[PDB]
Structure 1
Amino acid sequence: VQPHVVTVLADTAIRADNLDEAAILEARKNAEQLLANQKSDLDSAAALAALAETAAQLETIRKIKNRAQ
């Protein structure tokens, strides 16, 4: 507290009236973990699959260049 300014450095500062926000903090955690799940899926499912796919049979084609027939 200062004669004009007050700062509140709270660990967990939540706009609320009652100590019952447990119903919304879990919702926040589920949102974060769900978006993490989206990250893990779309990074893996898109790339890692396509990572293997794009590298399928390159040398098979590279050797059959020098075929003059």
Structure 2
Amino acid sequence: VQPHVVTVLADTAIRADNLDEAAILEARKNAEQLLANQKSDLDSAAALAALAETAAQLETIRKIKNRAQ
């Protein structure tokens, strides 16, 4: 603090409506954990299954292009 400028630095800071903030920060923790879990699920489902399923079977058709039966 000094007469022209005032600045206070804090490692962890939030509006202290109560003497504790764990009950408020737990909501953010739940949101972050849920977003991470859903993002992992979405990435896995969108990529791993789908791309492998598309790449599963393509050569049995390419090998028979010139067939006349």
What TM-score do the two structures reach when normalised by structure 2? Answer: 0.85
CA RMSD of aligned residues (A): 1.4
1:33 shift after superposition: 0.8
Q: What percentage of aligned pairs have identical amino acids?
A: 100
What SS does the corresponding residue of 2:38 show, helix, strand or coil? helix
In structure 2, the gaps of 5 or more residues are none
What SS does the corresponding residue of 1:68 show, helix, strand or coil? coil
Q: Determine the C-alpha separation between the residues in 2 that align with 1:66 and 1:13.
A: 72
In structure 1, the gaps of 5 or more residues are none
- Relative to its length, the structure with more helix (as a share) is 1
Q: Determine the C-alpha separation between the residues in 1 that align with 2:36 and 2:47.
A: 16
What SS does the corresponding residue of 1:41 show, helix, strand or coil? helix
What TM-score do the two structures reach when normalised by structure 1? Answer: 0.85
Runs of 4+, deviation exceeding 6 Å: none
